[PDB]
Amino acid sequence: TKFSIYPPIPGEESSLRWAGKKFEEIPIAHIKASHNNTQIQVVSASNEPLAFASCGTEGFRNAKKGTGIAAQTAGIAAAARAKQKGVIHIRVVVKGLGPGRLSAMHGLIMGGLEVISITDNTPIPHNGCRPRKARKL
Amino acid sequence: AKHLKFIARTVMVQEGNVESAYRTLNRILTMDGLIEDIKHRRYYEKPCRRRQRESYERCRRIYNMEMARKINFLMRKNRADPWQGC
Amino acid sequence: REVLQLQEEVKNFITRENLEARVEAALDSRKNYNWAITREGLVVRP
Amino acid sequence: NEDLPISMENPYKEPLKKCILCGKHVDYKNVQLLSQFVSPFTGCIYGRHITGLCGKKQKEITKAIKRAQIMGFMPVTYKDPAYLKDPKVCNIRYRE
Amino acid sequence: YHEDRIRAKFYSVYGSGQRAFDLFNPNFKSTCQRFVEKYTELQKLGETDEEKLFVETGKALLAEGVILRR
Amino acid sequence: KNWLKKFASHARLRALNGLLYKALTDLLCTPEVSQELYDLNVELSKVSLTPDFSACRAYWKTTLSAEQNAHMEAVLQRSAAHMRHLLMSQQT
Amino acid sequence: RFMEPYIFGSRLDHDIIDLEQTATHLQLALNFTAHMAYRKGIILFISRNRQFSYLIENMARDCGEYAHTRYFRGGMLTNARLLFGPTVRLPDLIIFLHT
Amino acid sequence: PRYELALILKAMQRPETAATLKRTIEALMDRGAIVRDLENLGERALPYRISAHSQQHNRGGYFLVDFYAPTAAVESMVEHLSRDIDVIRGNIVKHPLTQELKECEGIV
RNA sequence: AAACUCCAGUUGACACAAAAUAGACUACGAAAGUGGCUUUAACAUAUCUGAACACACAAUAGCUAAGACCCAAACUGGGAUUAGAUACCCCACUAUGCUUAGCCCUAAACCUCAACAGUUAAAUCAACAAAACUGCUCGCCAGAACACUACGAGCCACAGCUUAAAACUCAAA
Numbered sequence: 001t002k003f004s005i006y007p008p009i010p011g012e013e014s015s016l017r018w019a020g021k022k023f024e025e026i027p028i029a030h031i032k033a034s035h036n037n038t039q040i041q042v043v044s045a046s047n048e049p050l051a052f053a054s055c056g057t058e059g060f061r062n063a064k065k066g067t068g069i070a071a072q073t074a075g076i077a078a079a080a081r082a083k084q085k086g087v088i089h090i091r092v093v094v095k096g097l098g099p100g101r102l103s104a105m106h107g108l109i110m111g112g113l114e115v116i117s118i119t120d121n122t123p124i125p126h127n128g129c130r131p132r133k134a135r136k137l
Numbered sequence: 138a139k140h141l142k143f144i145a146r147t148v149m150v151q152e153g154n155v156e157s158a159y160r161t162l163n164r165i166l167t168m169d170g171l172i173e174d175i176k177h178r179r180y181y182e183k184p185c186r187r188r189q190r191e192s193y194e195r196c197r198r199i200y201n202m203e204m205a206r207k208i209n210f211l212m213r214k215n216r217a218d219p220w221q222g223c
Numbered sequence: 224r225e226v227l228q229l230q231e232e233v234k235n236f237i238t239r240e241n242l243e244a245r246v247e248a249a250l251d252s253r254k255n256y257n258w259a260i261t262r263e264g265l266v267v268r269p
Numbered sequence: 270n271e272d273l274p275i276s277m278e279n280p281y282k283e284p285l286k287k288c289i290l291c292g293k294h295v296d297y298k299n300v301q302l303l304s305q306f307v308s309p310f311t312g313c314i315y316g317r318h319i320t321g322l323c324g325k326k327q328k329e330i331t332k333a334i335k336r337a338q339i340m341g342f343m344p345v346t347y348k349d350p351a352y353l354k355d356p357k358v359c360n361i362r363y364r365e
Numbered sequence: 366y367h368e369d370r371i372r373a374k375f376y377s378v379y380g381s382g383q384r385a386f387d388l389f390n391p392n393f394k395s396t397c398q399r400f401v402e403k404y405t406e407l408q409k410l411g412e413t414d415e416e417k418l419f420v421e422t423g424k425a426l427l428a429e430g431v432i433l434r435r
Numbered sequence: 436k437n438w439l440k441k442f443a444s445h446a447r448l449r450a451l452n453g454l455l456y457k458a459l460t461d462l463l464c465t466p467e468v469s470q471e472l473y474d475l476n477v478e479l480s481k482v483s484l485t486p487d488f489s490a491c492r493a494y495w496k497t498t499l500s501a502e503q504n505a506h507m508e509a510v511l512q513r514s515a516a517h518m519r520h521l522l523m524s525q526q527t
Numbered sequence: 528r529f530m531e532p533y534i535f536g537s538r539l540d541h542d543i544i545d546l547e548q549t550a551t552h553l554q555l556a557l558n559f560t561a562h563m564a565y566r567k568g569i570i571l572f573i574s575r576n577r578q579f580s581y582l583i584e585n586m587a588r589d590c591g592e593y594a595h596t597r598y599f600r601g602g603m604l605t606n607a608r609l610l611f612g613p614t615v616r617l618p619d620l621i622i623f624l625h626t
Numbered sequence: 627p628r629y630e631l632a633l634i635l636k637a638m639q640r641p642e643t644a645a646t647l648k649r650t651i652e653a654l655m656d657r658g659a660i661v662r663d664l665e666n667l668g669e670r671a672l673p674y675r676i677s678a679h680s681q682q683h684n685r686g687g688y689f690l691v692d693f694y695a696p697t698a699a700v701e702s703m704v705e706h707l708s709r710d711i712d713v714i715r716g717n718i719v720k721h722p723l724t725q726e727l728k729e730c731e732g733i734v
Numbered sequence: 735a736a737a738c739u740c741c742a743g744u745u746g747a748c749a750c751a752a753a754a755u756a757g758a759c760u761a762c763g764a765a766a767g768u769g770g771c772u773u774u775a776a777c778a779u780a781u782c783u784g785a786a787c788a789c790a791c792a793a794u795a796g797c798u799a800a801g802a803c804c805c806a807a808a809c810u811g812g813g814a815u816u817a818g819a820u821a822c823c824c825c826a827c828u829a830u831g832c833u834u835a836g837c838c839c840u841a842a843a844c845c846u847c848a849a850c851a852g853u854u855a856a857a858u859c860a861a862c863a864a865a866a867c868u869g870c871u872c873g874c875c876a877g878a879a880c881a882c883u884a885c886g887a888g889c890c891a892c893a894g895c896u897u898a899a900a901a902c903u904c905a906a907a
């Protein structure tokens with residue numbers, strides 16, 4: 001059977017399973033990759049928080065939070081605390097274009113979790129609020 | 138917010154190749170124009186500047202395509218000289 | 224011709240007398256407006 | 270002389286090219302057809318350089334998509350997954 | 366020329382002949398040119414109905430032994 | 436504006452260098468410039484602005500292979516103008 | 528534009544030269560050439576089409592006339608005294624196979 | 627003129643849907659309309675979650691009402707559709723069949 | 735560094751704000767302007783020209799009354815900085831940007847091309863800009879500066895707008 005790049009539909013029954021569970025039952029790792037910080041929260045499919053880790057909660061301060069290594073460490077910490085609650089497979093939902101967009105996922109993988117899908121949910125207004133003016137540096 | 142989740146901007150991992158899935162997602166977001174929109178929305182672009190930028194980009198594309206067409210049309214003559222000496 | 228077409232068409236309009244029967248008949252019916260186009264310009268009905 | 274040329278319109282003139290939707294009605298209720306011209310992953314409407322439509326039908330499709338989206342017939346942020354297997358008419362490849 | 370119209374529609378119906386043109390021969394005779402000459406002959410020996418002339422000329426050429434795939 | 440003819444015809448410095456380094460890294464993080472550039476995975480070491488603001492030197496780390504170095508150099512030189520345009524269009 | 532009076536018409540976007548006019552023009556040109564050759568005038572053929580340089584040089588050598596199929600240096604005709612000598616005789620007739 | 631009402635009704639059982647359809651068509655007639663037909667497009671999942679009358683809806687029944695009404699009726703009808711608690715979303719458009727299918731010769 | 739920790743992440747509810755993609759289109763309108771969806775009204779004139787002042791309009795900014803306030807933001811505070819720091823960066827927050835009823839009447843309000851009708855033959859043509867011209871009408875211009883000024887007059891404008899000089903001076907501009 002040809003691999004489908006598209007995620008499974010909740011309604012349409014599918015045979016894809018991960019440790020016996022359907023796609024819509026897998027825990028979700030929400031990564032928020034800001035410009036100066038990366039925050040990772042693992043939640044259950046029913047939206048029950050299991051683990052949380054940010055670059056600041058891992059000891060990094062000021063500019064050191066906005067690096068790849070800090071996001072990787074936060075990912076490892078989140079993956080460890082999620083492993084301690086029975087999480088193996090995760091669906092990654094990444095929001096933002098910060099330096100830790102990919103390093104947090106790397107840290108999650110090195111912490112033992114298996115990523116089955118990647119979703120981007122970066123906020124894109126259809127021209128709502130007015131952004132701030134450019135910096136005159 | 139009111140839409141179903143895990144349908145938009147979602148990519149499945151093939152045989153644990155997370156890097157390939159991430160790069161495919163980056164390509165999708167780039168060719169759909171979302172990356173440039175996000176980066177251009179960080180600061181407000183004035184309407185006159187926005188219009189000037191779009192006009193410049195459109196005319197740059199047109200000029201580049203015309204130049205490429207001219208070069209490709211004239212490439213056919215670039216072969217070995219059939220009347221060498223004379 | 225338009226007038227005659229309208230004259231024959233009004234016979235099937237919904238009125239206060241046939242409202243309930245038509246409502247039930249519609250409830251037991253389905254209409255599909257969806258169809259797709261191919262690269263060759265051919266309509267593919269569902 | 271009878272061998273002289275005569276005035277006429279070009280008889281070898283090939284017919285003008287037409288878009289795939291030429292002569293066909295675009296309805297906002299036909300979510301299936303409208304879904305063929307939006308991105309599967311973002312729901313963004315494809316430009317004419319991708320769809321290959323003429324300006325008139327490009328405008329018709331755009332207006333129909335917006336009408337269906339605001340009147341609760343079509344999703345906005347993605348293509349309805351029920352139509353993901355419909356024939357591909359757009360010149361775009363994600364190498365997925 | 367007049368026959369150009371015939372030629373055009375010939376080239377639109379039977380297509381370009383699988384036979385090859387020989388422009389070096391000053392009196393080369395293509396399949397389309399044979400069709401044109403027969404069309405004009407029937408026109409001067411009959412009525413003026415473009416579709417009827419075309420079908421009749423096709424029948425005549427097939428009778429003579431010229432293949433013509435639409 | 437007759438485009439056809441147009442085509443036919445210090446503390447501040449350090450902050451600017453840091454800003455430009457971050458912006459250039461973020462530009463190279465995606466296929467925004469080009470897919471060919473993205474596939475090469477260019478890493479930047481630093482950005483240096485000349486004292487009179489006449490050029491921006493972006494120092495990229497070289498690899499061990501020489502054919503790859505030459506190809507990456509060619510792609511970067513061909514993409515420099517587009518990256519400049521992107522930097523000014525994003526109002527960095 | 529100046530070639531329009533000599534064009535019979537356009538056949539499927541390809542111009543056709545009216546050969547009836549070509550006949551009279553060629554008659555006049557050949558008559559002029561023959562009269563010049565009778566008077567022992569110097570005749571120079573000129574053409575920059577490299578496909579026919581050899582042919583034109585052979586023809587000029589055969590009829591006892593002169594050919595210039597090569598790069599035309601600035602001042603052959605308008606500066607002939609400096610480039611050939613003070614007593615050089617210029618051509619009495621020049622024939623362009625390619626203008 | 628000729629109008630088309632696209633109605634997204636609450637996902638109800640058959641009797642309530644019948645009553646709502648009767649009420650809507652009766653309102654149309656009371657505003658001076660002549661109803662031509664009523665088409666049921668089916669019950670389906672909404673493209674997005676719609677909040678109406680202090681209730682969240684993920685599913686709805688789609689119906690089409692073709693009718694002829696005076697121009698003054700439309701506004702009034704809109705108000706009525708805003709008050710019906712069993713209507714998730716009602717929209718009146720000019721009937722697409724009235725729009726003329728202008729013919730073109732192709733790409734210039 | 736200040737600031738916040740009634741903070742932050744997921745989920746749900748939730749605008750008097752702004753309208754991704756389409757638009758690589760070049761449309762509508764007298765101009766100014768106009769790019770989310772539906773509906774109702776609706777885009778003058780079968781010669782042309784015809785006004786600083788007549789009659790109706792005029793981006794942005796600004797001013798009266800009321801209202802809304804997400805975000806942005808002149809000013810105003812605070813944080814950080816040389817050796818008189820960054821006006822510039824960071825944080826907070828005004829007038830203002832929005833709606834309603836009135837003012838004000840200015841723009842690189844520019845295609846820096848006055849409106850209509852016509853021509854492509856002439857030497858094409860100071861230059862550059864945007865090929866060169868013809869007929870007809872209205873408007874306007876006759877060295878620089880004084881001067882987008884003074885005075886007079888008009889204006890819901892009160893050091894505001896429109897019209898707009900003279901003296902002295904110079905051989906240039």
Ligand code: FES
Nearest residue numbers: 287288291323732
């Ligand atoms: S070419 Fe016929 S409608 Fe597009």
Ligand SMILES: [K+]
Nearest residue numbers: 842844845846
């Ligand atoms: K301008």
Ligand SMILES: [Mg+2]
Nearest residue numbers: 782783784849
């Ligand atoms: Mg007038």
Ligand SMILES: [Mg+2]
Nearest residue numbers: 785786787873
């Ligand atoms: Mg006057």
Ligand SMILES: [Mg+2]
Nearest residue numbers: 792793839840
């Ligand atoms: Mg104004």
Ligand SMILES: [Mg+2]
Nearest residue numbers: 795796830831
């Ligand atoms: Mg104001």
Ligand SMILES: [Mg+2]
Nearest residue numbers: 803828829830
């Ligand atoms: Mg305010």
Ligand SMILES: [Mg+2]
Nearest residue numbers: 848849872873
């Ligand atoms: Mg005028």
Ligand SMILES: [Mg+2]
Nearest residue numbers: 876877878879
């Ligand atoms: Mg003067």
Ligand SMILES: [Mg+2]
Nearest residue numbers: 882883895896
């Ligand atoms: Mg004044």
